Design a protein around this ligand. Structure first.
Ligand code: CHL
Ligand code: CLA
Ligand code: CLA
Ligand code: CLA
Ligand code: CLA
Ligand code: CLA
Ligand code: CLA
Ligand code: CLA
Ligand code: CLA
Ligand SMILES: CCCCCCCCCCCCO[C@H]1O[C@H](CO)[C@@H](O[C@H]2O[C@H](CO)[C@@H](O)[C@H](O)[C@H]2O)[C@H](O)[C@H]1O
Ligand code: SF4
Ligand code: SF4
Lengths: 144, 184, 37, 80, 124
């Protein structure tokens, strides 16, 4: 598995449009692009409101925040049994790929992943807040 | 080609056009010393700033109907006698000026008390610097007109303008200067 | 010696109720919006 | 950014990963439980603080904990 | 994309906006400030004169209302100035810059007060 490269010329579903789409943020900070393959033309529900028809073959959509992309991904996987993937696109033209980070959806365990933010203790074994006081910033006992 | 006070005049070396309101007008070469120029530049503003407030005050007092002449106001009597005005003014005015000098030495810019620069509204810009001096220079020249016109005419600024407006050719400097005893 | 002039409220009420608030709000609005170097 | 911590009482049910609506969590190999897998939080910069993961954790007390912290465009869930 | 609509996308509407001082590019920000200030300043005098506290006084109503319209223009000019200070601290049009907006605010004050004064002259 290798990191996919986004194709900006991918066709988009048949959608009239709505007022729930991108705002000025997309032009200044970032936006998100989700792409997938469709076996047949079908009607799905846009997370921004309304219904759109997915073309047979590749499809591409642009959303304002990550949660909107992953909300559509859940719908496509659960009902239509598709395998979408989405990116983060910056105004400068850079494209960042994510979900699936390594090509396998996170629900399935995969070798090569490195545990992060894992504490080898229980919640009840954290230190008291007094012992992490005056540490330069508000710090919870869980952080240390 | 930056405009100069005299057309066709090349600005002298010590005037580089950096300071706001620069026009190459240093015929006597007073600003040739960089150390003195920095002091003079700040000194120009403060003389102008006092002038601008003074010109507004003289006009404001006249227009609002303040009967005493702007030069006779000192003799007038107020609730607080002169026994207390001078001691308060010296103490209050000294503190503002003492701290003004201290800040200028450290930073080199104007300020107020502990604020150097004193720009609460963030209006400071290269354009505003030029607008400050040019209005300031105008006030300085205008104020002297108030003082000189007081001697020649013994009349308030607007009263003089209205007199000039009344008869344009009349009520000029020639009448007051030639007929000095009458106006006195 | 202490008694202020009879016209003091005419100047100080508008000054503290309309003028200083305007400068204070402008000072605070600029300050909060100011960006760090 | 919020803080998300996984504690050693995890049984590797994967319910926290499925629940997360921003793909913040993932499962990694482990030897401390029968399932031989543990939850991980590699992408906390995308966490919004919904705490759907905590709702889904079967262990008592929770094995995944979310501590709301500094706010940002991503953690505040803004599309503008 | 965005929901197309005649109000959002129509030829007649677009041309009208393109001729307004705000959208008319190629004009110095100061001049646009004067043009905008004059229009608002002239209108601002109306409501103060007719519905002010001194509206029923025969001759003082005109003076008091216009003098209050001049005051509001002064407050608005301050709002324009500080907005530029906060917004532009670091693009195609010169207006949306620290230098441009400062000129724009100055023009609004000059135009606005001129409009208020011009409105007064119309009455008397
Ligand atoms: C800013 C400086 C300043 C200037 C330029 C003047 C200028 C003047 N004061 Mg004033 N004063 C100034 C500060 C002050 N005066 C006074 C208190 C007085 C008095 C009590 C008198 C003057 C008078 C005068 C005049 C003297 C004319 C003359 O004989 O020559 C002149 C218009 C005299 C006057 O009114 O002459 C007509 C006069 O009697 N001044 C106070 C309050 C302590 C001042 C404080 O800064
Ligand atoms: C408080 C008064 C004052 C001061 C300190 C200055 C200082 C300065 N001016 Mg400014 N200026 C003033 C008033 C003043 N000006 C006024 C009133 C006008 C309008 C008439 C101007 C118009 C002006 C121009 C057009 C230019 C300057 C410039 C300068 C610089 C010249 C170099 C130097 O070292 O000068 C030092 C000067 C002094 C120490 C002055 C000492 C006192 C003098 C000798 C008294 C003269 C009295 C006069 C003959 C009689 C009154 C006349 C009046 C009624 C018209 C310097 C920063 C030049 C510059 O580049 O500025 C950045 C420049 O281009 N000035
Ligand atoms: C350069 C600064 C300056 C100075 C030194 C003076 C000095 C004076 N003014 Mg003036 N004034 C100024 C600026 C100045 N004014 C400005 C900028 C305005 C316009 C807002 C006015 C408007 C004004 C009015 C309306 C009156 C004075 C009056 C006075 C006198 C009494 C001041 C007093 O009791 O204050 C008290 C101080 C506080 C309450 C603080 C005194 C001669 C009075 C007077 O009788 O003058 C002859 C008077 O009626 N002034
Ligand atoms: C019209 C004249 C004028 C102008 C354009 C400026 C411009 C400037 N001044 Mg200056 N100043 C002036 C008059 C002026 N000043 C006067 C009269 C005084 C004495 C009271 C001062 C005292 C002063 C200080 C102590 C400082 C400045 C500074 C500044 C800068 C920021 C403030 C600003 O932009 O104000 C813009 C001004 C206006 C939009 C006009 C306001 C008109 C008022 C409200 C009318 C008042 C009427 C009266 C009460 C009757 C800027 C270069 C700061 C600086 O140099 O920072 C580097 C600084 O520290 N000024
Ligand atoms: C801003 C500048 C200015 C303005 C607009 C006026 C306006 C007026 N002055 Mg005044 N005057 C001024 C400055 C000014 N003066 C100065 C600086 C002085 C001292 C030399 C005088 C001395 C003076 C006298 C003695 C008389 C007037 C009078 C008058 C009136 C008739 C015109 C006249 O006599 O002009 C004469 C003005 C000048 C010769 C100077 C003009 C300004 C110069 C060009 C400034 C720059 C000089 C230099 C380049 C630096 C009129 C209201 C008369 C009056 O009261 O009528 C009712 C009157 O008798 N003025
Ligand atoms: C914290 C105490 C306090 C409070 C709550 C008030 C409240 C009031 N004062 Mg008073 N005042 C105080 C202390 C206080 N004053 C002191 C210590 C002095 C002596 C300098 C004055 C001198 C004073 C005057 C001259 C006037 C008022 C007036 C007023 C009224 C309007 C606000 C105003 O103009 O303030 C103005 C406040 C000051 C000039 C002094 C403020 C000093 C601090 C340190 C800032 C209001 C009832 C006005 C009034 O009576 O209207 C009807 C009015 O004209 N006050
Ligand atoms: C202490 C605070 C304060 C003060 C002093 C005032 C004062 C005033 N208010 Mg009130 N007001 C306030 C707070 C205040 N208000 C607040 C917080 C609110 C919101 C709840 C209101 C809402 C309000 C309304 C809705 C109205 C008033 C009005 C008035 C006026 C009533 C008296 C009259 O007949 O004026 C007559 C006024 C004049 C003859 C002109 C006075 C001077 C004008 C307003 C400004 C001149 C500026 C000058 C030309 C240039 C700048 C000078 C400056 C730099 C020194 C008077 C100017 C009435 C009014 O007429 O407003 C215009 C009015 O309709 N106020
Ligand atoms: C509260 C609302 C209000 C009020 C009371 C006024 C009051 C006034 N308006 Mg204004 N006006 C307003 C809002 C208002 N206007 C608005 C929202 C607009 C649209 C931008 C206008 C556009 C307008 C125009 C174009 C004219 C007036 C004019 C007038 C005057 C009409 C006098 C008459 O008897 O007829 C009067 C001062 C007239 C005027 O000032 O004539 C000298 C005038 O020509 N008004
Ligand atoms: C919304 C409610 C409301 C309304 C309509 C009024 C109305 C009025 N009040 Mg009152 N007032 C209110 C609430 C209200 N008040 C409240 C809540 C308080 C308590 C804080 C007061 C306290 C108060 C005081 C103390 C005074 C008044 C006074 C007044 C009068 C003058 C106000 C004035 O000068 O406005 C100025 C108006 C404007 C600057 C413009 C108004 C808005 C314009 C018309 C919008 C136009 C939009 C346009 C149609 C858009 C076109 C778009 C197109 C071009 C595309 C007027 C009868 C004064 C008076 O004397 O009354 C008799 C007075 O002294 N009011
Ligand atoms: C650096 C700062 C320098 C000083 C700046 C001073 C700015 C000007 C402040 C003026 C304040 C008002 O002051 C002015 O009020 C009244 C004007 O008719 C005068 O007051 C006098 O006359 C009034 C009108 O008949 C009466 O109601 C008063 O009882 C009487 O005391 C004051 O004697 C005068 O000084
Ligand atoms: S944290 Fe809880 S829900 Fe997630 S894998 Fe561990 S036991 Fe299961
Ligand atoms: S709080 Fe919400 S976004 Fe963060 S890890 Fe838990 S489920 Fe995911």
């Amino acid at each position: 598995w290798t990191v996919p490269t986004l194709n900006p010329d991918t066709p988009s579903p048949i959608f009239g449009g709505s007022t729930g789409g991108l705002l000025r943020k997309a032009q200044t900070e970032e936006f998100y692009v989700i792409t997938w393959e469709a076996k047949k033309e079908q009607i799905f529900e846009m997370p921004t409101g309304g219904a759109a028809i997915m073309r047979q073959g590749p499809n591409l959509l642009k959303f304002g925040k990550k949660e909107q992309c992953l909300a559509l991904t859940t719908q496509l996987r659960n009902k239509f049994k598709l395998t979408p993937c989405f990116y983060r696109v910056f105004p400068d033209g850079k494209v960042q790929y994510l979900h699936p980070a390594d090509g396998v959806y996170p629900e399935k365990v995969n070798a090569g992943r490195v545990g992060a933010n894992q504490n080898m203790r229980r919640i009840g074994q954290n230190v008291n807040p007094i012992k992490v006081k005056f540490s330069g910033r508000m710090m919870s006992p869980a952080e240390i | 080609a930056r405009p100069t006070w005299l057309p066709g005049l090349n600005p002298p070396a010590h005037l580089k056009g950096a300071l706001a309101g620069d026009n190459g007008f240093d015929p006597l070469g007073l600003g040739q010393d960089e150390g003195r120029l920095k002091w003079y530049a700040e000194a120009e503003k403060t003389n102008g700033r006092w002038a601008m407030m003074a010109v507004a005050g003289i006009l404001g007092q006249e227009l609002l109907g303040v009967t005493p002449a702007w030069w006779e106001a000192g003799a007038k009597e107020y609730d607080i006698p002169a026994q207390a005005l001078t001691p308060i003014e010296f103490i209050v005015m000294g503190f503002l000026e003492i701290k003004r000098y201290q800040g200028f030495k450290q930073t080199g810019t104007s300020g107020f008390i502990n604020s150097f620069p004193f720009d609460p509204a963030g209006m400071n810009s290269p354009s505003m610097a030029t607008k400050e001096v040019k209005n300031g220079r105008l006030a300085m020249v205008a104020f002297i007109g108030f003082c000189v016109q007081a001697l020649a005419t013994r009349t308030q600024p607007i009263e003089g303008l209205t007199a000039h407006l009344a008869d344009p050719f009349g009520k000029n400097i020639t009448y007051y200067l030639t007929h000095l005893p009458e106006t006195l | 010696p202490f008694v202020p002039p009879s016209w003091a409220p005419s100047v100080f009420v508008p000054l503290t109720g309309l003028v200083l608030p305007a400068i204070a709000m402008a000072t605070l609005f600029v300050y909060i919006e100011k960006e760090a170097p | 950014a919020h803080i998300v911590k996984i504690y050693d009482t995890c049984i590797g049910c994967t319910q926290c990963v499925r629940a997360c609506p921003l793909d913040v969590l993932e499962m990694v190999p482990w030897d401390g439980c029968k399932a031989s897998q543990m939850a991980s939080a590699p992408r906390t910069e995308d966490c919004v603080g919904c705490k759907r993961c905590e709702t889904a954790c079967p262990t008592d007390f929770l094995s995944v904990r979310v501590y709301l912290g500094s706010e940002s465009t991503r953690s505040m869930g803004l599309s503008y | 994309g965005m929901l197309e609509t005649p109000v959002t996308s129509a030829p007649i509407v677009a041309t009208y906006l393109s001729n307004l001082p705000a959208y008319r590019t190629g004009v110095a920000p100061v001049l646009r400030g004067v043009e905008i200030g004059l229009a608002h300043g002239f209108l601002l005098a109306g409501p103060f004169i007719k519905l002010g506290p001194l509206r029923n006084v025969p001759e003082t109503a005109e003076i008091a209302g216009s003098l209050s319209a001049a005051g509001l223009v002064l407050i608005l000019a301050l709002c324009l100035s500080i907005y530029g200070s906060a917004q532009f601290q670091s693009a195609r049009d010169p207006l949306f810059s620290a230098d441009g907006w400062s000129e724009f605010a100055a023009g609004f004050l000059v135009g606005g007060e001129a409009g208020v004064a011009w409105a007064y002259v119309c009455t008397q």
